[PDB]
Amino acid sequence: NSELDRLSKDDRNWVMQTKDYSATHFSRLTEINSHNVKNLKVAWTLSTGTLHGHEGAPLVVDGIMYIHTPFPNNVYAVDLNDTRKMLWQYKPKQNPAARAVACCDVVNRGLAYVPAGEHGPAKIFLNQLDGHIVALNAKTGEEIWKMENSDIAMGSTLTGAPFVVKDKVLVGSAGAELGVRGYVTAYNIKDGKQEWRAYATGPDEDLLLDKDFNKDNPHYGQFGLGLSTWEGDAWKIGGGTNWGWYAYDPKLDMIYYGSGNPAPWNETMRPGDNKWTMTIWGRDADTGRAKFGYQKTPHDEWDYAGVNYMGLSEQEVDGKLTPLLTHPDRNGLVYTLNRETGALVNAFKIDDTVNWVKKVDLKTGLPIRDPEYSTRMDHNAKGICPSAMGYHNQGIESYDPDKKLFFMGVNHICMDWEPFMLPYRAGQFFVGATLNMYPGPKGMLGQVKAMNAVTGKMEWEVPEKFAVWGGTLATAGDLVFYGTLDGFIKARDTRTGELKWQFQLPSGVIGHPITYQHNGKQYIAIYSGVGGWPGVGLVFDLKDPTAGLGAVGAFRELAHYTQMGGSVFVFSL
Amino acid sequence: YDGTHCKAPGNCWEPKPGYPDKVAGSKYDPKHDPNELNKQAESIKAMEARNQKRVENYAKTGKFVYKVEDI
Ligand SMILES: O=C(O)c1cc(C(=O)O)c2c(n1)C(=O)C(=O)c1cc(C(=O)O)[nH]c1-2
Numbered sequence: 305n306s307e308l309d310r311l312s313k314d315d316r317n318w319v320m321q322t323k324d325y326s327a328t329h330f331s332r333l334t335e336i337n338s339h340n341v342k343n344l345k346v347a348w349t350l351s352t353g354t355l356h357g358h359e360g361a362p363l364v365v366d367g368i369m370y371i372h373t374p375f376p377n378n379v380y381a382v383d384l385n386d387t388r389k390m391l392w393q394y395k396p397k398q399n400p401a402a403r404a405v406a407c408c409d410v411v412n413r414g415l416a417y418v419p420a421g422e423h424g425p426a427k428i429f430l431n432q433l434d435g436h437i438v439a440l441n442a443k444t445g446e447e448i449w450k451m452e453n454s455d456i457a458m459g460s461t462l463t464g465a466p467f468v469v470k471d472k473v474l475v476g477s478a479g480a481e482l483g484v485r486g487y488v489t490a491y492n493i494k495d496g497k498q499e500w501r502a503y504a505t506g507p508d509e510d511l512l513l514d515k516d517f518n519k520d521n522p523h524y525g526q527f528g529l530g531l532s533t534w535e536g537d538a539w540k541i542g543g544g545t546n547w548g549w550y551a552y553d554p555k556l557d558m559i560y561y562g563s564g565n566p567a568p569w570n571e572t573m574r575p576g577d578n579k580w581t582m583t584i585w586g587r588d589a590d591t592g593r594a595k596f597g598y599q600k601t602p603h604d605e606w607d608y609a610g611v612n613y614m615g616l617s618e619q620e621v622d623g624k625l626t627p628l629l630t631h632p633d634r635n636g637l638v639y640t641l642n643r644e645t646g647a648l649v650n651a652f653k654i655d656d657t658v659n660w661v662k663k664v665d666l667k668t669g670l671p672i673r674d675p676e677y678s679t680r681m682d683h684n685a686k687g688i689c690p691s692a693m694g695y696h697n698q699g700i701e702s703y704d705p706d707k708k709l710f711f712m713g714v715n716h717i718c719m720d721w722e723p724f725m726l727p728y729r730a731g732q733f734f735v736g737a738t739l740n741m742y743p744g745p746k747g748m749l750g751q752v753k754a755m756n757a758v759t760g761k762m763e764w765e766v767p768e769k770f771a772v773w774g775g776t777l778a779t780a781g782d783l784v785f786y787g788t789l790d791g792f793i794k795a796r797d798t799r800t801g802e803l804k805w806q807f808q809l810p811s812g813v814i815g816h817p818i819t820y821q822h823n824g825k826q827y828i829a830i831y832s833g834v835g836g837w838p839g840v841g842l843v844f845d846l847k848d849p850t851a852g853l854g855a856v857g858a859f860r861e862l863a864h865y866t867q868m869g870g871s872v873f874v875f876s877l
Numbered sequence: 878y879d880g881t882h883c884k885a886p887g888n889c890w891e892p893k894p895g896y897p898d899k900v901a902g903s904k905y906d907p908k909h910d911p912n913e914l915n916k917q918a919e920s921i922k923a924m925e926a927r928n929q930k931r932v933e934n935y936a937k938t939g940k941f942v943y944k945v946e947d948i
Pocket residue numbers: 359406407408411461462463464477478479480481545547564607609692693697698835836837838
């Protein structure tokens with residue numbers, strides 16, 4: 305959407321979760337910089353009025369900030385000239401049964417936005433946990449339309465954020481832990497009319513393939529693979545839900561996202577490469593037809609759900625300036641692809657302790673597996689890196705285009721895993737594996753890193769007590785900001801990683817920071833409100849270290865540092 | 878099973894040493910009820926049909942109604 309694109313180039317706005325269509329999370333604002341950030345102070349705050357994890361972050365468009373909560377997914381709008389008043393409020397009624405089919409806390413990754421057009425008034429888009437996509441008027445909050453995307457009776461929910469492209473809003477999916485076959489849907493923004501729906505497994509007509517699907521890399525596989533990489537009808541409950549993030553190249557007219565893990569977690573129940581789970585997609589915006597499809601993790605054995613963000617850049621690859629996507633997966637590989645052809649440019653390890661794979665063969669595209677870190681029935685595999693939580697999870701990361709550096713919040717969590725057999729019953733969990741998690745061999749649970757994605761070269765690496773879960777924000781003031789699960793917001797210098805500032809927030813952060821200019825002054829804002837997957841233990845009062853799909857044990861100290869909360873903090877000089 | 882030996886392009890799965898080729902008939906048979914499997918798709922079909930009604934109604938009257946029984 306070319307107006308949306310233009311509004312995103314204005315430093316007064318923060319028009320989508322990803323900031324811009326390339327998901328740069330990079331601001332040109334310099335008022336706040338490496339040499340004065342030490343004087344950054346809290347300017348004002350809001351309460352969201354809920355507890356549980358607060359992922360994503362606010363939006364700002366045309367002097368209005370927009371706020372969203374976890375279940376029941378209430379939304380508020382705040383005029384930036386009168387920050388104490390709520391301009392409007394929307395408060396969904398949802399079946400509380402929706403809570404019982406969320407695997408890992410009732411998080412919501414947030415709103416999207418489209419400016420006024422032929423469709424026509426400006427809209428805010430909300431995905432609800434109960435499976436509805438709602439369109440609200442941006443200035444009044446009025447409910448314009450509301451459709452059913454996902455059925456909670458089947459374990460099918462929504463957590464990932466909507467995504468506005470041209471006249472279309474996109475809606476992902478969730479519940480691969482309950483055997484939900486994944487699908488992404490484009491609704492027309494005027495109407496709420498279903499335009500297309502692409503599934504992650506099964507027949508080629510359901511996958512929505514272009515006739516030239518994988519033309520440029522036929523060794524990735526092409527047609528019939530969504531059936532022939534499964535045994536019988538196992539694909540029907542096959543996972544590949546897409547609850548993460550998207551990107552868009554308006555020149556190529558292509559949408560980019562990743563499909564999630566195959567179901568069940570028990571690898572012995574679904575022999576086959578389980579295509580096209582775990583796949584970096586390049587789809588045509590108007591039709592949804594895939595032009596490329598790269599499977600990162602064939603026959604997943606680790607729940608390396610392939611939904612993480614897509615960061616677009618233009619960088620030199622063998623002396624030639626090339627359009628790229630970069631993508632730090634749960635499997636602890638940082639993938640960089642040509643975003644036109646889908647050709648693999650690199651796949652390096654985000655940390656050398658990754659052990660399920662020795663390396664990716666770049667000619668073949670295949671990860672060469674170490675059998676000693678496999679999972680399989682009748683075996684409790686010990687010492688696997690990454691754990692299911694990944695060396696990278698749902699955080700949107702950042703790209704400084706001057707430095708050619710990506711800045712990332714990295715997890716350092718490893719695991720034991722043992723499957724068990726279980727039936728599929730629609731509506732019930734369908735995991736079939738028992739996990740135990742703990743730090744990686746470096747000892748700590750998080751890192752923050754800076755890297756060049758083309759060369760694999762690490763610029764700097766600093767440790768963090770807890771996994772850095774919420775993503776980063778970089779700026780041309782030479783600073784990268786992020787929130788920690790123990791409830792700090794922090795700023796490091798982007799050249800060295802030197803810590804320049806921190807502040808103690810009420811609760812842990814699992815969202816990203818944003819920044820914008822309002823009446824000539826730069827602000828930074830962030831949600832505080834711990835939860836999500838690391839927080840399941842403290843959120844639900846779990847004691848058994850295998851509960852919360854293994855997170856409980858890794859994260860049992862988190863409760864010594866933070867409680868639940870729900871607030872928005874805005875900082876300035 | 879190292880993921881590098883491919884029966885076809887994009888299909889590199891092999892069973893692990895000691896584990897079976899196909900799971901049907903083995904001790905790891907999923908034994909899926911074909912009706913349980915089909916439930917999702919049918920729930921999607923019903924959701925798509927109720928949405929279709931909401932759109933038809935917005936187009937007929939100019940006013941959005943969510944509840945299909947009030948249409
Ligand atoms: O398959 C799925 O459907 C599904 C859904 C969700 C969700 O709804 O947030 C997560 C996951 N998977 C998942 O594998 C995961 O690691 C995860 C982390 C979080 C979080 O926000 O902390 N949600 C989810």
